[PDB]
Amino acid sequence: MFNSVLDTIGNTPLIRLSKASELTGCDIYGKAEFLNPGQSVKDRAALYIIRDAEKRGLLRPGGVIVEGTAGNTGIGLTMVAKALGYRTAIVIPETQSQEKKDALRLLGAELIEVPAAPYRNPNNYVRLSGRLAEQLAKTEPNGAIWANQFDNTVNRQAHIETTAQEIWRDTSDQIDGFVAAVGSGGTLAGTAIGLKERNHNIKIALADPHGAALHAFYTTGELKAEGDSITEGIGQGRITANLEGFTPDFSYQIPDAEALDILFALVEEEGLCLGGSSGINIAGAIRLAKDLGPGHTIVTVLCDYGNRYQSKLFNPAFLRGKSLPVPRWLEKEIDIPFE
Amino acid sequence: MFNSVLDTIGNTPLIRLSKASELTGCDIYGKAEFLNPGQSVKDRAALYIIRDAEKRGLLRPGGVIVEGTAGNTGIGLTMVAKALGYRTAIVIPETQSQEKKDALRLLGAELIEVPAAPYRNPNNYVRLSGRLAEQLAKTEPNGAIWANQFDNTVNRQAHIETTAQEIWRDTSDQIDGFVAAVGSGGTLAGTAIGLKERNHNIKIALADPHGAALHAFYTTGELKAEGDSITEGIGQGRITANLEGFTPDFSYQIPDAEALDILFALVEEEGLCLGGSSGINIAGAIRLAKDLGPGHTIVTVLCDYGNRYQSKLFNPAFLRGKSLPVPRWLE
Numbered sequence: 001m002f003n004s005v006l007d008t009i010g011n012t013p014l015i016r017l018s019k020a021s022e023l024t025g026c027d028i029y030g031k032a033e034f035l036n037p038g039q040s041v042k043d044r045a046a047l048y049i050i051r052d053a054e055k056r057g058l059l060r061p062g063g064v065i066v067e068g069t070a071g072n073t074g075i076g077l078t079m080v081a082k083a084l085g086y087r088t089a090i091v092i093p094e095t096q097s098q099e100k101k102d103a104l105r106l107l108g109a110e111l112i113e114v115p116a117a118p119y120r121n122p123n124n125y126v127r128l129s130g131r132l133a134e135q136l137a138k139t140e141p142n143g144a145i146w147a148n149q150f151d152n153t154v155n156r157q158a159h160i161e162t163t164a165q166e167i168w169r170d171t172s173d174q175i176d177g178f179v180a181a182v183g184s185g186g187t188l189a190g191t192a193i194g195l196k197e198r199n200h201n202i203k204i205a206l207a208d209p210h211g212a213a214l215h216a217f218y219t220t221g222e223l224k225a226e227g228d229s230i231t232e233g234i235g236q237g238r239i240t241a242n243l244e245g246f247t248p249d250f251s252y253q254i255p256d257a258e259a260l261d262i263l264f265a266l267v268e269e270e271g272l273c274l275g276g277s278s279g280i281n282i283a284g285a286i287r288l289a290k291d292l293g294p295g296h297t298i299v300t301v302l303c304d305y306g307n308r309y310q311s312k313l314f315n316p317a318f319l320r321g322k323s324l325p326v327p328r329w330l331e332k333e334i335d336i337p338f339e
Numbered sequence: 340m341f342n343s344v345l346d347t348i349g350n351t352p353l354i355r356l357s358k359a360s361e362l363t364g365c366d367i368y369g370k371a372e373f374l375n376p377g378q379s380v381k382d383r384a385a386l387y388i389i390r391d392a393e394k395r396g397l398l399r400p401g402g403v404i405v406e407g408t409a410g411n412t413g414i415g416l417t418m419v420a421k422a423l424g425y426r427t428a429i430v431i432p433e434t435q436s437q438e439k440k441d442a443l444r445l446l447g448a449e450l451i452e453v454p455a456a457p458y459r460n461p462n463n464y465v466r467l468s469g470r471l472a473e474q475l476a477k478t479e480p481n482g483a484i485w486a487n488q489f490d491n492t493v494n495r496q497a498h499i500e501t502t503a504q505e506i507w508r509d510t511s512d513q514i515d516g517f518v519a520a521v522g523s524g525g526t527l528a529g530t531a532i533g534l535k536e537r538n539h540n541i542k543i544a545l546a547d548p549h550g551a552a553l554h555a556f557y558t559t560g561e562l563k564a565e566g567d568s569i570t571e572g573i574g575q576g577r578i579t580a581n582l583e584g585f586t587p588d589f590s591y592q593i594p595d596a597e598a599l600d601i602l603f604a605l606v607e608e609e610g611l612c613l614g615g616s617s618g619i620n621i622a623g624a625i626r627l628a629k630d631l632g633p634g635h636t637i638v639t640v641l642c643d644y645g646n647r648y649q650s651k652l653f654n655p656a657f658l659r660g661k662s663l664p665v666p667r668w669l670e
Contacts, residue, residue: 001509002353002354002355004357005354005371005611008374014340015343015346016340029340032376035347035374037373078610084610105669106606106645106646106649108607270422271345271376271417271418271421310445330444334471336451336467336471338462338467339461
């Protein structure tokens with residue numbers, strides 16, 4: 001018996017990744033964040049951000065949550081917002097697909113379409129969404145907040161208090177390592193805080209895609225983001241406020257091909273069809289398990305479903321255009337017994 | 340710690356439906372079957388069907404599960420099949436949502452689209468899938484089973500053993516009524532059996548869409564269907580083997596407009612974007628609560644997500660073409 005969809009956020013199960021476990025002589029588990037009602041890991045941050053703004057009086061019923069995202073954050077924020085009586089203004093580049101605009105719109109998000117741009121530009125959708133929030137605060141009686149996922153540390157706080165404690169509880173205190181990729185850094189940094197408080201010997205690893213700066217920074221102190229990735233929701237170019245004070249014990253740079261191989265074999269072999277960040281994360285978990293050696297328990301995050309990436313990540317034509325692997329089963333008939 | 344994705348099937352939570360509850364003076368809950376790993380209620384039957392075939396020695400790794408389905412059954416079956424080392428051959432009517440077809444192909448189902456046809460026609464998807472299972476059985480050494488959801492009563496058994504017991508447990512024995520719509524009838528008949536074993540004066544209702552024959556059967560003794568519904572996964576014209584011996588205490592016929600009004604209001608007011616059958620179900624729940632009177636606990640099923648029918652059920656152009664309401668927030 002639960003009072004709203006909000007009580008179904010979190011307490012997600014750990015699923016044993018069988019091929020990754022067999023390969024490493026470790027128990028490697030993936031946290032099923034896809035089983036949140038918003039269908040991603042962002043339900044946690046979305047809940048914490050909105051609850052924080054409520055607690056601080058910055059939102060009243062009918063108020064607006066502004067965020068720049070395209071965008072599990074948008075989905076999570078809009079679901080939570082509609083459950084609590086708020087609205088969302090999701091700032092999105094106009095050049096983003098009609099597919100992603102429709103998933104957000106379906107849930108009642110009000111899209112603000114703007115020209116695409118890089119982070120250095122003040123009209124970049126992330127940065128623009130902050131100034132929009134400050135503007136709307138004057139003409140919205142019930143308030144207007146910037147969710148500010150990247151630099152709002154209640155994001156990290158969500159994983160300290162929920163994710164980490166669930167992992168500690170569900171591994172019966174036996175977790176030896178945790179690995180995750182970084183967008184905002186809330187998941188990795190927050191879960192790291194939570195876990196290391198329980199047992200300071202737990203090892204934390206970053207799993208970084210090509211095109212992100214964090215691997216280079218943590219390993220050599222260099223400032224470089226070579227290459228790129230088709231993965232979405234991850235790949236960070238600065239030390240966000242959620243990343244402040246955080247140092248990983250290990251760091252891995254995972255190419256797209258290694259992530260996609262894992263991801264495609266997971267569908268055929270384990271019935272899990274997940275997003276690109278899950279490919280990166282599982283690859284990181286395998287590497288962490290190899291570094292710690294056999295007889296250890298590794299946990300990572302299965303952040304969302306692969307259905308949302310179907311038109312690129314599981315699209316043969318797009319993948320071949322990127323010189324990346326293709327799902328074996330999509331290329332591949334029977335005589336149908338009509339009459 | 341769950342050995343595979345299969346262990347996350349079931350133990351789904353009850354979500355209080357606030358508008359429905361307030362309107363009726365009852366606590367109305369929807370069981371969140373969309374939180375299954377295959378994203379629908381069909382994970383339960385799919386798991387039971389495949390496990391039963393295994394126990395009977397009908398499947399070995401490399402074997403094939405054949406099913407005629409509106410889509411979700413094939414999704415659940417394909418997820419379970421892939422986790423256990425089987426293939427699926429899924430027969431779907433071409434009329435079903437594009438998003439189900441997409442999800443099927445995505446999870447690795449061999450997808451066979453066929454024309455819509457009534458059950459009297461032997462090229463009906465269900466009847467045709469049975470003959471395909473028979474054909475494939477001749478040349479599949481690892482085995483080929485017909486999942487046969489409509490008439491395979493391990494479907495109903497799944498709901499007797501899991502769904503019903505969860506509802507009883509999670510309401511702390513306070514549940515007074517249960518309502519759901521019928522495709523195969525496993526959900527409604529199975530849950531009703533399990534609940535009525537624990538408390539025989541729990542009341543059960545059918546929520547039936549236009550185009551189904553069941554409301555007319557239970558209220559008049561005659562299987563008669565009129566009109567049509569845009570809801571998918573429900574709408575049955577015969578007493579299937581999963582419906583044998585089922586009699587509801589109440590039966591309601593729910594028009595689409597009533598279902599969609601609930602569904603659309605649910606997105607904006609409660610943060611729940613659900614499939615067509617969920618609207619039919621919640622409508623039923625409201626009517627059951629009103630028939631039972633205030634201060635009761637009513638449970639229904641939230642079968643799957645709205646995104647699974649997005650191109651039709653939340654599409655202004657299609658809905659206008661059907662003379663149906665349009666979500667207000669889609670300008």
